[PDB]
Amino acid sequence: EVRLVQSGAEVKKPGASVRVSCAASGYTFTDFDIHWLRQAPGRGLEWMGWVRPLGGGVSYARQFQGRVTMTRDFYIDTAFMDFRNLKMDDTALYFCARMGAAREWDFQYWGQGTRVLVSSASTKGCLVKDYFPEPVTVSWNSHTFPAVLQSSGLYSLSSVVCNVNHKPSNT
Amino acid sequence: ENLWVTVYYGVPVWKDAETTLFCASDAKAYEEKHNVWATHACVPTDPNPQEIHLENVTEEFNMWKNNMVEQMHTDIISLWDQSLKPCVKLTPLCVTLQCTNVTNNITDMRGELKNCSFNMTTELRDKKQKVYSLFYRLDVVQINSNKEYRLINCNTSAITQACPKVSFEPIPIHYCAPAGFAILKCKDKKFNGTGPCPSVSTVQCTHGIKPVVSTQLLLNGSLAEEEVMIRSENITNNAKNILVQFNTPVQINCTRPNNNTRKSIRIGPGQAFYATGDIIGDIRQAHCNVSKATWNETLGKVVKQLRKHFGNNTIIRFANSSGGDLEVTTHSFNCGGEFFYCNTSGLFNSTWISNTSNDSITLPCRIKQIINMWQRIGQAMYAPPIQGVIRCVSNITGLILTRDGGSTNSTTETFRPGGGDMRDNWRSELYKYKVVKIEPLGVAPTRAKRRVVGGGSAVGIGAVFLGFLGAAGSTMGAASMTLTVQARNLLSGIVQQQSNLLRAPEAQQHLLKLTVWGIKQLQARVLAVERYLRDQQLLGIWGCSGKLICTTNVPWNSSWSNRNLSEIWDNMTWLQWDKEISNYTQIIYGLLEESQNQQEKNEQDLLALD
Amino acid sequence: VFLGFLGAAGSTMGAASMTLTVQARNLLSGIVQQQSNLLRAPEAQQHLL
Numbered sequence: 001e002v003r004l005v006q007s008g009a010e011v012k013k014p015g016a017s018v019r020v021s022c023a024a025s026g027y028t029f030t031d032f033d034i035h036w037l038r039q040a041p042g043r044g045l046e047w048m049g050w051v052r053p054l055g056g057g058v059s060y061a062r063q064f065q066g067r068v069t070m071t072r073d074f075y076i077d078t079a080f081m082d083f084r085n086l087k088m089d090d091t092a093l094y095f096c097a098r099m100g101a102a103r104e105w106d107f108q109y110w111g112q113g114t115r116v117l118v119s120s121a122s123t124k125g126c127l128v129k130d131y132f133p134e135p136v137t138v139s140w141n142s143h144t145f146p147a148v149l150q151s152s153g154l155y156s157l158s159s160v161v162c163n164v165n166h167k168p169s170n171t
Numbered sequence: 172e173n174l175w176v177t178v179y180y181g182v183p184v185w186k187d188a189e190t191t192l193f194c195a196s197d198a199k200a201y202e203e204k205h206n207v208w209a210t211h212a213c214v215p216t217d218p219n220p221q222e223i224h225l226e227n228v229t230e231e232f233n234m235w236k237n238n239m240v241e242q243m244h245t246d247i248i249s250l251w252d253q254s255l256k257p258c259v260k261l262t263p264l265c266v267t268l269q270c271t272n273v274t275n276n277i278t279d280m281r282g283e284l285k286n287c288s289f290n291m292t293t294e295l296r297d298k299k300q301k302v303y304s305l306f307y308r309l310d311v312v313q314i315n316s317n318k319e320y321r322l323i324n325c326n327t328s329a330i331t332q333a334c335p336k337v338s339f340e341p342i343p344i345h346y347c348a349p350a351g352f353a354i355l356k357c358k359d360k361k362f363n364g365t366g367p368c369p370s371v372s373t374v375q376c377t378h379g380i381k382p383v384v385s386t387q388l389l390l391n392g393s394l395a396e397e398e399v400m401i402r403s404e405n406i407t408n409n410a411k412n413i414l415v416q417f418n419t420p421v422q423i424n425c426t427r428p429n430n431n432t433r434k435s436i437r438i439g440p441g442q443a444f445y446a447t448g449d450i451i452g453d454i455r456q457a458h459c460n461v462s463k464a465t466w467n468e469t470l471g472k473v474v475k476q477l478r479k480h481f482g483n484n485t486i487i488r489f490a491n492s493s494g495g496d497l498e499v500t501t502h503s504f505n506c507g508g509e510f511f512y513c514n515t516s517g518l519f520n521s522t523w524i525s526n527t528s529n530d531s532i533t534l535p536c537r538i539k540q541i542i543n544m545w546q547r548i549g550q551a552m553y554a555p556p557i558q559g560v561i562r563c564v565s566n567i568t569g570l571i572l573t574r575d576g577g578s579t580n581s582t583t584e585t586f587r588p589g590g591g592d593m594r595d596n597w598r599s600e601l602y603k604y605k606v607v608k609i610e611p612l613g614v615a616p617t618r619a620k621r622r623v624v625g626g627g628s629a630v631g632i633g634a635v636f637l638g639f640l641g642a643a644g645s646t647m648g649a650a651s652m653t654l655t656v657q658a659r660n661l662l663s664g665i666v667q668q669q670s671n672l673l674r675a676p677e678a679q680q681h682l683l684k685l686t687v688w689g690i691k692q693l694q695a696r697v698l699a700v701e702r703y704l705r706d707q708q709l710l711g712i713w714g715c716s717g718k719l720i721c722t723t724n725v726p727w728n729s730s731w732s733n734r735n736l737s738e739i740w741d742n743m744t745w746l747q748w749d750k751e752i753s754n755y756t757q758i759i760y761g762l763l764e765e766s767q768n769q770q771e772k773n774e775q776d777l778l779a780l781d
Numbered sequence: 782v783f784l785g786f787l788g789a790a791g792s793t794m795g796a797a798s799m800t801l802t803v804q805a806r807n808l809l810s811g812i813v814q815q816q817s818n819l820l821r822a823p824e825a826q827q828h829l830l
């Protein structure tokens with residue numbers, strides 16, 4: 001019944017310094033170290049840092065020195081990761097995992113993950129209306145295809161079997 | 172030709188297992204010291220300690236899984252709660268404070284000290300009183316030119332004040348094993364963390380370890396010999412800490428130059444709270460001074476050894492703390508009754524690569540009075556103020572480092588000092604020890620057979636006895652020559668009144684009652700009796716009640732071992748013998764218990780039956 | 782045909798006297814499968830308790 005819960009997907013312009021939360025449950029949180037791993041769509045998993053709950057000790061990777069900082073809170077059994085001065089190359093999915101009971105470099109428990117995309121696009125953003133960001137809600141009278149990424153960054157799609165609600169417009 | 176099973180009592184065969192150790196510590200004074208580590212509850216060791224050197228014994232132990240560190244750990248933590256429980260509780264001190272910065276010329280001096288007046292209770296319930304005190308910046312937080320301040324622990328945990336009389340000074344305490352158990356002490360100067368120790372001895376209680384809580388630098392520890400040691404569970408894995416042991420001590424001088432004063436303001440009937448009064452003299456920072464020539468020289472010893480694991484020519488840099496609470500980030504240590512917190516950035520900024528003023532290094536140290544030792548939840552201690560100026564001088568004997576990691580390899584290596592846990596402070600001293608239980612019932616085949624059922628001397632100067640468990644590395648024949656040596660020590664004190672003889676003094680445990688070691692002793696003396704009477708009960712069914720060596724009529728099966736009598740007794744230790752027969756030792760104990768000695772009873776009396 | 786511990790309590794005095802090591806094993810320590818003394822060996826069970 002042990003599971004790690006991460007924060008939600010967030011979008012930010014370069015230099016925005018996002019923080020992510022990792023909720024622990026089902027076990028004694030103050031025992032095992034928490035690790036932050038990031039995976040790009042065309043790259044393998046990458047290890048960022050580990051922070052243990054008792055004393056907050058943390059070891060950060062060479063390339064993330066001065067860029068990332070991790071802490072935690074015992075009362076909420078949650079470890080946080082502050083990633084300052086984010087860059088266009090650093091857009092990927094962020095996972096927080098816990099080492100297995102064998103104490104070797106293996107991960108037995110993970111989290112659902114958070115989506116962090118860095119880009120320069122306006123927040124405001126059948127045939128589709130420019131609905132940036134990507135999430136849309138298509139419905140017929142109150143077969144859907146994936147979206148396409150243009151050079152401007154706006155997402156276009158199509159739905160064939162409308163009045164699709166837009167989160168930036170709040171219709 | 173015909174081989175029969177033989178029972179031996181007192182064979183030097185031991186197995187490692189976890190048992191509840193007790194305490195041993197020399198009596199420094201008849202006395203009110205009330206040292207927290209012991210209230211004199213640990214019974215005093217004999218003036219002369221007996222250490223036995225074992226010949227041809229290669230017993231290895233694992234430092235990281237060593238069970239002795241966790242027992243002490245839970246021992247100090249239990250000892251602290253037993254000392255703070257009788258002290259007064261500062262539950263009424265969680266009151267909105269109105270603080271004014273202490274008299275100081277602001278040049279930036281950014282004094283952490285505050286001067287706060289609060290409405291405190293008094294001896295009478297209806298009456299109150301407006302008294303003032305002084306608190307550092309780390310003890311108070313802002314609650315939304317005096318403004319409202321709140322004590323840091325009020326929102327999270329209750330607080331209790333340490334009794335003024337108890338002293339936090341570390342004293343040596345030895346841990347011994349109960350009767351019927353043994354402790355093996357490695358004497359290898361170049362001993363690695365985990366692995367075989369070619370020269371092993373045995374001792375009843377370990378040399379006393381001064382329990383010193385230190386976060387970044389080990390204090391007043393045991394010096395290494397020759398080259399400094401770099402003990403680690405896995406040097407390649409960064410998660411495990413890197414424990415170091417020094418061969419030359421590095422002296423450190425710490426002071427609190429502020430001449431504080433103690434003000435006892437009665438806050439309850441029979442209860443008195445101790446607050447800081449007017450500070451006499453200049454406002455100064457707490458600082459620690461370490462000589463740079465010696466620190467530069469020692470740091471050069473640690474960096475030389477580290478290259479063996481990572482290569483001759485690689486970049487070995489030292490860095491600062493990379494994060495964590497105030498505990499891990501600074502050199503948190505206690506002195507004179509208060510708790511310093513020293514930034515060690517000046518010690519750990521250096522870069523070493525390949526080869527090729529005389530002023531001391533000074534450390535800005537903060538001081539805090541409200542602390543939660545060992546990151547415990549729901550608890551907090553307020554250390555009372557220490558009147559007058561205090562000085563500290565200790566020896567630095569070890570560090571706790573960390574691997575930086577990263578994607579790049581063989582380009583640069585940086586070590587960041589850290590104090591993640593207090594257990595690593597005990598592994599730095601219990602590394603050379605291991606707990607084993609001795610098992611004295613070793614069976615072996617011999618052509619000797621039981622005296623027929625129908626049937627019915629050297630006086631001394633035996634040579635070169637080896638002491639207790641000394642024959643563990645000698646041949647089975649030579650080891651079988653000394654059986655009364657172990658049988659003496661299976662029960663009661665192994666040496667010099669080791670345990671049972673000690674528990675005789677009055678009011679030692681009566682006053683102690685169940686506090687601390689009092690329950691440790693009962694579990695150690697009852698388990699001793701239960702293991703001794705277990706072997707005697709095993710004999711009672713097996714015959715051989717009063718005999719150290721008995722031969723009874725039981726055939727030795729050839730499938731248990733195909734080795735002949737000579738090769739077994741010519742060049743084998745009882746330890747190696749117990750390993751091969753371990754698979755069949757339980758069956759032998761079943762055939763020999765009834766078929767060997769109860770068939771006799773049913774036949775022996777039938778023989779005389781009417 | 783051994784009867785186990787106290788199995789000969791309903792048999793004759795002669796038949797019951799045939800099994801005496803059965804009880805003598807069980808008078809002290811665990812009667813069966815590490816029943817008591819073998820169990821109290823794990824650490825921090827009673828110390829914490």
Ligand SMILES: *[C@@H]1O[C@H](CO)[C@@H](O[C@@H]2O[C@H](CO)[C@@H](O[C@@H]3O[C@H](CO[C@H]4O[C@H](CO[C@H]5O[C@H](CO)[C@@H](O)[C@H](O)[C@@H]5O)[C@@H](O)[C@H](O)[C@@H]4O)[C@@H](O)[C@H](O[C@H]4O[C@H](CO)[C@@H](O)[C@H](O)[C@@H]4O[C@H]4O[C@H](CO)[C@@H](O)[C@H](O)[C@@H]4O[C@H]4O[C@H](CO)[C@@H](O)[C@H](O)[C@@H]4O)[C@@H]3O)[C@H](O)[C@H]2NC(C)=O)[C@H](O)[C@H]1NC(C)=O
Nearest residue numbers: 001002003004005006023024025026027028029076077078
């Ligand atoms: C006569 O006999 C009858 C039969 O035995 C008795 O009936 C029994 O009654 C008891 C209660 O008295 C029931 O226990 C409770 O069942 C609840 C429902 O169980 C669900 O989950 C079960 C297991 O699911 C876990 O493991 C499975 C795999 O096995 C896994 O797939 C799943 O994801 C999960 O990890 C599942 O088997 C059931 O079918 C159900 O799906 C269960 O929720 C209860 O747990 C509560 O309460 C208990 C007791 O108080 C706590 O010990 C638990 O920690 C948890 O308490 C929660 O609230 C607390 C407040 O103090 C928190 O402190 C806890 O942390 C916790 O909060 C939860 O959520 C957090 C957020 O994520 C987590 O972090 C925490 O971990 C917690 O999950 C409890 O088990 C029996 O189920 C029921 N029997 C049967 C057969 O159903 C009858 O009572 C007897 N008669 C009498 C008079 O007594």
Ligand SMILES: *[C@@H]1O[C@H](CO)[C@@H](O[C@@H]2O[C@H](CO)[C@@H](O[C@@H]3O[C@H](CO[C@H]4O[C@H](CO[C@H]5O[C@H](CO)[C@@H](O)[C@H](O)[C@@H]5O)[C@@H](O)[C@H](O[C@H]5O[C@H](CO)[C@@H](O)[C@H](O)[C@@H]5O)[C@@H]4O)[C@@H](O)[C@H](O[C@H]4O[C@H](CO)[C@@H](O)[C@H](O)[C@@H]4O[C@H]4O[C@H](CO)[C@@H](O)[C@H](O)[C@@H]4O)[C@@H]3O)[C@H](O)[C@H]2NC(C)=O)[C@H](O)[C@H]1NC(C)=O
Nearest residue numbers: 381390391392393394419420421422423564565566567568
């Ligand atoms: C911080 O770090 C510092 C170091 O940087 C730490 O300081 C060090 O602390 C340790 C203790 O932990 C001290 O060790 C003690 O040293 C003394 C002195 O030893 C010298 O004198 C011995 C006796 O002298 C004889 O001769 C003189 C005249 O010449 C007579 O006056 C005497 O009466 C004697 O007859 C002598 O034997 C010693 O020889 C040593 O050195 C030679 C090489 O020179 C070696 O080969 C020897 O093996 C030996 O090492 C030396 O000359 C010792 O005397 C202390 O030992 C005694 O006391 C112990 C406690 O009671 C006891 O257990 C020992 O058995 C021993 O008692 C013996 O000697 C007594 C006196 O003669 C007898 O009465 C007794 O019956 C028995 O025979 C101990 O070794 C360090 O010296 C000290 N460092 C310095 C520089 O001083 C500091 O503690 C650290 N702080 C921390 C960690 O908090």
Ligand SMILES: *[C@@H]1O[C@H](CO)[C@@H](O[C@@H]2O[C@H](CO)[C@@H](O[C@@H]3O[C@H](CO[C@H]4O[C@H](CO)[C@@H](O)[C@H](O)[C@@H]4O)[C@@H](O)[C@H](O[C@H]4O[C@H](CO)[C@@H](O)[C@H](O)[C@@H]4O)[C@@H]3O)[C@H](O)[C@H]2NC(C)=O)[C@H](O)[C@H]1NC(C)=O
Nearest residue numbers: 279281490491492493494500514515516517518519520521
């Ligand atoms: C040992 O450990 C220490 C402490 O971790 C390390 O030092 C940190 O180092 C930096 C400089 O590298 C210190 O600088 C502080 O910067 C603060 C904020 O500015 C930062 O961000 C801005 C942009 O927002 C940048 O322009 C700026 O350059 C910084 O990057 C200031 O607010 C700090 O002032 C603080 O102290 C004064 C009183 O002294 C207060 O009045 C202020 O309110 C504020 O508290 C300061 O200038 C920082 O102090 C150090 N702390 C941190 C946060 O880590 C060492 O590098 C490390 N190693 C060694 C060898 O010493």
Ligand SMILES: *[C@@H]1O[C@H](CO)[C@@H](O[C@@H]2O[C@H](CO)[C@@H](O[C@@H]3O[C@H](CO[C@H]4O[C@H](CO)[C@@H](O)[C@H](O)[C@@H]4O)[C@@H](O)[C@H](O)[C@@H]3O)[C@H](O)[C@H]2NC(C)=O)[C@H](O)[C@H]1NC(C)=O
Nearest residue numbers: 428429430431432433448449450451452558559560561562
């Ligand atoms: C930290 O602050 C402390 C005060 O809170 C300092 O304590 C002071 O220490 C000095 C000596 O170093 C004492 O002086 C002695 O006083 C006695 C008695 O004084 C009598 O005479 C004086 C006038 O000379 C008078 O004021 C007194 O009331 C007495 O009538 C003399 O006999 C000695 O010769 C010597 O002068 C101070 O008395 C003492 N203060 C207190 C309040 O007791 C302490 O020294 C400071 N820390 C450090 C490291 O210096």
Ligand SMILES: *[C@@H]1O[C@H](CO)[C@@H](O[C@@H]2O[C@H](CO)[C@@H](O[C@@H]3O[C@H](CO)[C@@H](O)[C@H](O)[C@@H]3O)[C@H](O)[C@H]2NC(C)=O)[C@H](O)[C@H]1NC(C)=O
Nearest residue numbers: 266267268269270287288289290291299300301302317319
């Ligand atoms: C110590 O306790 C005493 C009371 O025993 C405090 O004195 C009281 O301080 C309060 C403000 O905190 C005064 O309240 C005043 O109320 C009027 C309205 O009635 C308001 O207009 C004022 O602005 C103010 O809020 C109160 O009159 C005063 N005196 C009393 C109750 O006799 C004292 O401040 C406390 N000191 C501390 C907490 O440091």
Ligand SMILES: *[C@@H]1O[C@H](CO)[C@@H](O[C@@H]2O[C@H](CO)[C@@H](O[C@@H]3O[C@H](CO)[C@@H](O)[C@H](O)[C@@H]3O)[C@H](O)[C@H]2NC(C)=O)[C@H](O)[C@H]1NC(C)=O
Nearest residue numbers: 073075076309311312313314321322323324325326327328
């Ligand atoms: C008990 O009280 C203490 C003192 O107020 C709390 O400590 C502080 O808690 C805050 C979060 O509530 C920590 O984060 C802060 O967040 C704000 C919002 O972004 C930010 O502006 C601050 O600069 C700060 O990051 C804060 O670091 C922390 N400070 C200390 C010294 O501990 C504590 O959380 C309270 N605990 C409970 C259980 O109420």
Ligand SMILES: *[C@@H]1O[C@H](CO)[C@@H](O[C@@H]2O[C@H](CO)[C@@H](O)[C@H](O)[C@H]2NC(C)=O)[C@H](O)[C@H]1NC(C)=O
Nearest residue numbers: 421422423424425459460461462463531532564
């Ligand atoms: C710490 O203070 C002690 C004194 O309390 C210093 O010891 C002195 O060392 C010098 C030589 O370096 C001797 O001449 C003095 O006689 C020693 N003092 C005494 C009382 O014997 C020690 O050197 C200081 N160390 C540091 C690192 O500051």
Ligand SMILES: *[C@@H]1O[C@H](CO)[C@@H](O[C@@H]2O[C@H](CO)[C@@H](O)[C@H](O)[C@H]2NC(C)=O)[C@H](O)[C@H]1NC(C)=O
Nearest residue numbers: 491492500501513514515516517518520534535
């Ligand atoms: C630890 O101590 C070092 C000094 O030895 C501090 O370095 C300075 O902090 C000041 C802010 O008051 C900065 O302006 C300096 O730049 C820092 N030094 C360096 C070399 O950059 C360091 O900040 C301290 N860190 C902590 C957590 O106390």
Ligand SMILES: *[C@@H]1O[C@H](CO)[C@@H](O[C@@H]2O[C@H](CO)[C@@H](O)[C@H](O)[C@H]2NC(C)=O)[C@H](O)[C@H]1NC(C)=O
Nearest residue numbers: 489490491492514515516517518519520521522
């Ligand atoms: C570690 O020591 C070095 C010097 O060896 C310090 O370097 C200083 O760097 C500044 C520029 O940032 C120079 O202006 C100083 O003159 C240098 N120091 C000296 C003594 O010349 C470095 O800052 C130190 N780091 C820490 C954390 O203490």
Ligand SMILES: *[C@@H]1O[C@H](CO)[C@@H](O)[C@H](O)[C@H]1NC(C)=O
Nearest residue numbers: 225226227228644645646742
């Ligand atoms: C046993 O130890 C002795 C020294 O006590 C040594 O002389 C002898 O060679 C050793 N024999 C074996 C087999 O280890």
Ligand SMILES: *[C@@H]1O[C@H](CO)[C@@H](O)[C@H](O)[C@H]1NC(C)=O
Nearest residue numbers: 274275276277278279280281
């Ligand atoms: C007080 O500090 C200020 C800082 O600018 C300094 O200029 C002044 O000379 C100092 N005066 C005294 C009396 O300490």
Ligand SMILES: *[C@@H]1O[C@H](CO)[C@@H](O)[C@H](O)[C@H]1NC(C)=O
Nearest residue numbers: 269270271288289316317318
């Ligand atoms: C409030 O500030 C004044 C001036 O600094 C001080 O005299 C007083 O003692 C402070 N506390 C109160 C009024 O409780």
Ligand SMILES: *[C@@H]1O[C@H](CO)[C@@H](O)[C@H](O)[C@H]1NC(C)=O
Nearest residue numbers: 464467468471520521522527
């Ligand atoms: C002293 O430290 C410096 C680096 O800070 C180093 O270059 C020098 O070699 C050290 N001294 C000695 C005698 O090694």
Ligand SMILES: *[C@@H]1O[C@H](CO)[C@@H](O)[C@H](O)[C@H]1NC(C)=O
Nearest residue numbers: 475476478479480482483484
């Ligand atoms: C020094 O490095 C050389 C070349 O790699 C190597 O042959 C030698 O064993 C090293 N010596 C020491 C003391 O590490």
Ligand SMILES: *[C@@H]1O[C@H](CO)[C@@H](O)[C@H](O)[C@H]1NC(C)=O
Nearest residue numbers: 727728729730731755758762
């Ligand atoms: C030895 O005794 C075992 C039973 O303990 C039996 O199975 C075996 O046949 C006997 N003989 C030999 C030669 O192993």
Ligand SMILES: *[C@@H]1O[C@H](CO)[C@@H](O)[C@H](O)[C@H]1NC(C)=O
Nearest residue numbers: 732733734735736737738739
């Ligand atoms: C049995 O003992 C004899 C004489 O020591 C020896 O030569 C022979 O190799 C041994 N064989 C076995 C199987 O132990």
